[PDB]
Amino acid sequence: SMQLNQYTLKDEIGKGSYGVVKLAYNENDNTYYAMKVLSKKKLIRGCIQPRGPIEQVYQEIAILKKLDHPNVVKLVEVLDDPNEDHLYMVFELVNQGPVMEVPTLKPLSEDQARFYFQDLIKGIEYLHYQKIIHRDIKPSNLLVGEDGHIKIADFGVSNEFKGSDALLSNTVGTPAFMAPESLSETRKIFSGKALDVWAMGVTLYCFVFGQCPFMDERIMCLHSKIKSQALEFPDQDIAEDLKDLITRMLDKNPESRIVVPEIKLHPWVTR
Ligand SMILES: CC[C@@H]1C(=O)N(C)c2cnc(Nc3ccc(C(=O)NC4CCN(C)CC4)cc3OC)nc2N1C1CCCC1
C-alpha cells in the first residue's frame, strides 16, 4: 500500500485514459473510498474544438459538487496541489462495482432489469432537474451499492445548462449509446435530455439481452447502423410491454422519442 494524506491506497479498481482508480482507506473515519488518480501531464498527452483536458476535468468536478442523490455517485474530496502532477478525486465507495460489462453471456432477468431501470429513472430525473445532461449512460457506468441499488457514475462528458434543455453540438459519449441526431456529418444542434433517454433505452436493451441493439467493431459502421437500421429484437423472449418501452426510447426522431415523465408512467415500469 501507500499513504496519501489520511488515506491508505490499496488495490487498483479501475483504469482508463483518465488514469487509475484506487481503493482508499481513510484512517481518520475507518471507511473505504474510491480514489481516482489523474496525471496532468498525461491528460495534456459535431467535431467542435472542446476546452482543454485538465479544464474538462474541472468541469466534471464542478458538476459532481452539485449532486446529492441516492442514485448518483458522491464526490467527497479533491486534492490538487498546484506544484504536483497528480489530481485526486475521492468518491464514496460503491461496494459492488459496475452492474455489468457488455457484452456478456449473463444478461439480467426482466425483474432485476426493472429494479435497476427504476433506479436509473430516478437518477436521470434528478440529473435533469439539476440541469445536467449525463451523455454517457451505459451499464458499466451504473454502480451497485451495498443497498443493492444503482448509482450513476462518470460525469466526464456531462453538460450543465440553463433553461429548459441543453443546446448541444459536440459528438461525445460511448459510440454504441449515442443517439442518431448526434451523429450527422452535417454540423447541427440537438437537445440534451433526449440523448440521455436514447442511452437509457440502449442500456435497458443491454440489461435484458447482454448485447447492444446496434453493434459493430467498426465505429463508422456502428454510427451508420444507429442512424439507418431498424431496431430488432432477438428471438431469445421478453414481454411485449418491455419491447414497447424500449422501442419508444429508441425512436430515431428525438421530437417523438418518449420523455422521462412518460417513462415513469409506462406499464412495464409501474408493474
Ligand atoms: C471512482 C470512479 C467511479 C465512481 O464514480 N465511484 C463513486 C466508484 C465507487 N466505487 C467503485 N467501486 C468499485 C469499482 C470496481 C471494482 C472492481 O472490482 N474492479 C475490478 C478490479 C480488477 N480489474 C482487472 C477489473 C476491475 C470494485 C469496486 O469497489 C469495491 N467504483 C467507482 N468508480 C469506478 C467504477 C469502475 C472503476 C471505478
From Swiss-Prot:
Residues 7-269 form the Protein kinase domain. The active site is at D136. Signal peptide: none annotated. ATP binds at I13, G14, K15, G16, S17, Y18, G19, V20, V21, K36. Ubiquitously expressed with higher levels in the brain. Intermediate levels are detected in spleen, prostate, thyroid and leukocytes. The lowest level is in lung. Coiled coil: none annotated. It is found in: Nucleus; Cytoplasm; Cell projection, Neuron projection. Autophosphorylated and phosphorylated by PKA. Each isoform may show a different pattern of phosphorylation. It comes from the Eukaryota. Calcium/calmodulin-dependent protein kinase belonging to a proposed calcium-triggered signaling cascade involved in a number of cellular processes. Isoform 1, isoform 2 and isoform 3 phosphorylate CAMK1 and CAMK4. Isoform 3 phosphorylates CAMK1D. Isoform 4, isoform 5 and isoform 6 lacking part of the calmodulin-binding domain are inactive. Efficiently phosphorylates 5'-AMP-activated protein kinase (AMPK) trimer, including that consisting of PRKAA1, PRKAB1 and PRKAG1. This phosphorylation is stimulated in response to Ca(2+) signals. Seems to be involved in hippocampal activation of CREB1. Belongs to the protein kinase superfamily. Ser/Thr protein kinase family. Interacts with calmodulin. The autoinhibitory domain overlaps with the calmodulin binding region and may be involved in intrasteric autoinhibition. This is Calcium/calmodulin-dependent protein kinase kinase 2. It comes from Homo sapiens. The gene is CAMKK2. The chain holds residues 161 to 448 of 588 of the full protein.
